[PDB]
Design an enzyme around this catalytic site. Sequence first.
Site: not given
Length: 386
Positions: A36, A228
């Site tokens: 992430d 992201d």
Amino acid sequence: GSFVEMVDNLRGKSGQGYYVEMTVGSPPQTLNILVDTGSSNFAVGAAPHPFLHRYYQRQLSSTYRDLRKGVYVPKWEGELGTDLVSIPHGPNVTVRANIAAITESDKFFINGSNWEGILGLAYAEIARPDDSLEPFFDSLVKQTHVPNLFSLQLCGAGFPLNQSEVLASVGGSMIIGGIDHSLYTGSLWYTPIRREWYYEVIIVRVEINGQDLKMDCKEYNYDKSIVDSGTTNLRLPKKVFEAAVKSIKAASSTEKFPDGFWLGEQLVCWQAGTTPWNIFPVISLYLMGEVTNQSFRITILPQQYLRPVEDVATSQDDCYKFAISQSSTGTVMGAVIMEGFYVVFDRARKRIGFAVSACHVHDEFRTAAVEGPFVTLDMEDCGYNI
Ligand SMILES: CCCCNC(=O)NCc1ccc(CN2C(=N)N[C@](C)(CC(C)C)C2=O)cc1
């Protein structure tokens, strides 16, 4: 490719995330961990959960150290500590890192994702409880000789992967400390990391099939633009979303799609192999370059922004959901956008590089692209200031 040991070390898909295998504790406890770039905490399931078939057992680790501090992230709650961590298919090093042991969670773990934790690769500024909790990658670089850089090749299959297929399929590569040249074609183009918290960048121009969306460029970065891998969709600021959808609808007007489709809620299906890729436009995002008044563009295809999903009837149709959605928190270049490119997070030079991915899905007529340079003026004005 000089990092063969890390090539093909990822599994997963845009909708549930891409994960890498890691080990925590002594003796090592193997866990699948979500990659992430949109968060900064290393956190792992540490207690029984309906969606976890394994979790971190602190009492079984001789190297476990309790920090006697809780952590709340709205949602998952955990207990802070440190322990020895390794990445089997990564650099051959073991580091002592902060680990948030998740003891309670709500809507965090995804049934069938096959991941039991999350690896937050962004900066300490957004780490919880605060910036004093050193992020995993910072620990890695401070404790070893690993270069302060990592690169991601997220590979979407271009079609639905069933529960057994997604477990046996290679989903990409996370190269820790380097750039592997077998993962991309063409040239790498770098855009400045605007500020070190999220991986923040600045978009200076947007085109739909070459047509300028023509909005004040600050609109594109309101209130920020980030890369992201923990978000599935390309997310756009409300007004930009509205303008982009209007333009995408106009370009694809030879076919009418229900409002539910454009809302990213309902799937659309075509007879096997007949998806009309060509009626959908390519989307180009111009990013601030490293040279004054110079930008470059990354172009994605509908093979990236239409996410493959299995028909509610499991039929033989090829079905997809529209993977572009509105945001109230700025632009988010999520996994479906990252699937078209090899993305280099060059922390040491505070820049993010983009190159066409050797695994992006395309057709015989169009390909994703990373092109430059383009003369662009006043790009610093495209950044948003509260
Ligand atoms: C893993 C993919 C989950 C489903 N696909 C999404 O798009 N779901 C919506 C969504 C919105 C915002 C964010 C931002 N985001 C992160 N990047 N990390 C966290 C802190 C935790 C995440 C990883 C659960 C977060 O909220 C992440 C996900």
